[PDB]
Amino acid sequence: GADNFTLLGKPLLRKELVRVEATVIEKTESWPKINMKFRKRKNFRKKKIIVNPQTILRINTIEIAPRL
């Protein structure tokens, strides 16, 4: 999108028209998530934690050209 105009892919724009670049900032994981399945006599020790990985990206530049 631009100030007064926009471009829509069908379903994607040509690679020449648009180039987008970003940078990786951090590699991290997810804060613990609690999983507990339902069962009779649940007990307190039937617990599992999920700490799946994570990563951070920072947008750097968006480039377009008059290649219509």
Partner: protein, 148 residues
Amino acid sequence: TGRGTSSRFLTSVLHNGLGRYVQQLQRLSLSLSRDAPSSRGAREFVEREVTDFARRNPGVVVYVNPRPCAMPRIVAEYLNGAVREENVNSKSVEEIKSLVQKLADQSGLDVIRIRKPFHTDNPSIQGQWHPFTNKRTALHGLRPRELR
């Protein structure tokens, strides 16, 4: 648990990657014992992999202090002020190497639930919708039912 736990929004320390990426970890402290089964993996790590990590990352201050110690411990300090301690009790060389690499990649930012995975300082470009949007005007700005 979420009701009983805190949360934050997406944020960056000081826009680290805008100009150049800076490593948050600044100082590493290692305690070892000459004779201890718990430190065996750490003992071998110093022999082989400690040098490689230092060469790979020369900007982090590493302190290695072999001493009579019950449980070897690793302390990591970050630029933002975060300090993290990890026990090396009876951990293998491979486990130690992975942990240090993870510590270097991690930032001092708090690890809690993030409400929004997206942060933008200019969410709107064409203007935020308001009720007057798409409302047709009238000649002379006549309000409804105005006889004039």
